[PDB]
């Protein structure tokens, strides 16, 4: 058996959860993201796990952010900070979107699941975003389910 057969899972959920905090830091002059960690994630290997990593994009090079890459497991520990320089008057008008990815070694990563968050979200993804705009200097911190797309 190849190495990437190892890596492959089709198929064909239940993509899994993500812990995410968000606080806007008026001393720093900046948004900070937190990627905790994860819940339930689907696996995406033939072991019945995934090797785990999160990416941000900070929408519409300083944009992008990504987690270390967590070995064989659907719970992954992340306790990673992001920062964005931004000031508070036009976070309002960005969108953050949040993957979550299967690394693969002889083969293309495989997508897990993801969830956007911003003005233009819908129910708890917009709230989290909303909460941490209304409120400066405080961490907020949110579970969201990953969808597809
Ligand atoms: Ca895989
Ligand atoms: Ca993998």
Redesign the pocket.
């Known amino acids: 058996m190849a190495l990437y057969e190892?890596?492959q899972v089709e198929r064909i959920e239940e993509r899994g959860k993500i812990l995410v905090s968000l606080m806007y830091s008026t001393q720093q002059g900046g948004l900070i993201v937190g990627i905790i960690r994860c819940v339930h994630l689907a696996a995406?290997?033939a072991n019945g796990?995934?090797?785990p990593f999160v990416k941000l994009w900070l929408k519409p090079k300083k944009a992008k952010h990504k987690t270390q890459i967590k070995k064989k497991t659907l719970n992954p520990e992340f306790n990673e900070e992001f920062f964005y320089d931004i000031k508070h008057s036009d976070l309002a008008k960005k969108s953050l979107d949040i993957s979550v990815w299967?690394?693969?070694?002889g083969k293309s990563?495989?997508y897990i699941g993801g969830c956007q968050l911003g003005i233009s979200a819908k129910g708890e993804r917009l709230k989290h975003w909303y909460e941490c705009l209304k409120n400066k200097d405080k961490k907020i911190e949110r579970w969201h389910q990953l969808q597809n797309e």
């Open positions: 190892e890596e995406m290997d796990y995934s090797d299967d690394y693969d070694i990563n495989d």
